[PDB]
């Protein structure tokens, strides 16, 4: 009865065959159309994975902010393979168990946190990819969020910024997850504000690990930053 | 596989075809002094190709940069550079290697002059300063308000860049173009070139269409030839 299925979240739709051909023979693929409505796509994603019995093959052709949202409501009852499009075709992320991602670490090999102590709003920046975002996020926060002296957590990577292989993505996601729990020891935050310069698979896996435990807001860059998912919306998806 | 040849002429395509693997078709894109039209036709040609692309370009580095910007960074490519009377392949089988952000730079160095939120970028591998001429143009024709300036130039290397170092120089340049954003959040980048075509292409690939950018070309004087709005509308 239980049988593997593909779920493809895409800003387009026409290109789904590339994903399908990468999967085992006779794997059905359910397409979720992302049209610039984050909460609707997350809702449809939840609806789809809720009723799936079996291993889920995921791919997401779309923003990392959406990937993070989908991760947050994914939960920990289902297994998945994450497929990523690179230098030719789709390749599976080394199959990462959900419980494995939430493992807390004492030693980090890749992530480098820079914590700036402030108030109860924490601005989280995953500064992992080619495009440098720190000053852009701070300018946006200062001009648009109307917060008093927010705390900042900028996370950069040692060595691999802008060139993260598939094979390191589970490790980077695990390390990020562990840091996001560590930071809560500094103080009790009211709210986490998430900004990404980050591969989609990592964003998804970090969302899976972090979950919907804290008040959070997810932000997307499209010429400027805007909030695209809130804790309230994500809670109401279930 | 196919080859795409972007050229200010057209008649000379056969040496490119001959350099490629047997039975590679080549599409010529004829540049006639309209940058946005050539970039449009380039994008139209490569848009639905996923596999490896062979590229060559006979024309200005400013065009090469524009083609790089709309190429994206999902597709692998070989750039065939014409040097010392023949074509030489620059194979890029991992595009992310061009986008790796660096702490250690071996071949290029930044010279940053702090100003406002317009950044004037000079990609100058010539071993003779272009800053005075660019500044005169900026002050007199663009009338920008207290722009920041970033010159990127060679260090250590005293002459031409060998083929073998062109990916490295492009990678380092691209990394510096992101590193400068640590100084402040810029609103707009203005690109001026004195540089080899393959480097311009590779830097365009990495930089992408992520910041408001304007591309300038030197032909006796400087003029803008590509804007962010035009490039956005190509897609």
Residue numbers in the entry:
A (entry chain B): -2 to 235
B (entry chain A): 1 to 235
Question: Can you provide the manuscript's text about this entry?
Answer:
The structure of AcrIII-2, solved by molecular replacement with X-ray crystallography with data to 1.79 Å resolution, revealed two molecules in the asymmetric unit. Each molecule resembles a canonical SAVED subunit, which sits in a head-to-tail configuration. The structure of an AcrIII-2 monomer comprises two CARF-like domains tethered by a 19-residue loop. Each CARF domain contains a five-stranded β-sheet sandwiched between three α-helices; strands 1 to 4 of the β-sheet lie parallel, whilst the fifth strand is anti-parallel. The loop fusing the domains is followed by a six-residue β-strand that lies anti-parallel to the first β-strand of the canonical C-terminal CARF domain, in essence making this a six-stranded β-sheet. The crystal structure of AcrIII-2 revealed a dimeric composition in the absence of cA4, with SAVED subunits orientated similarly to that observed in the cryoEM structure of the CalpL filament bound to cA4. Coupled with the observation of a dimeric species formed by cross-linking in the absence of cA4, these data suggest that apo AcrIII-2 dimerises, and it is likely the dimers and longer filaments are stabilised upon cA4 binding. It does, however, demonstrate that the global orientation of the two AcrIII-2 SAVED domains is not significantly different from the SAVED domains of CcaCalpL, meaning AcrIII-2 was highly likely to bind cA4 at the dimer interface.
Here, we show that thermophilic viruses have appropriated the SAVED domain of CalpL as an anti-CRISPR, AcrIII-2 (second anti-CRISPR of type III systems), which they use to degrade cA4.
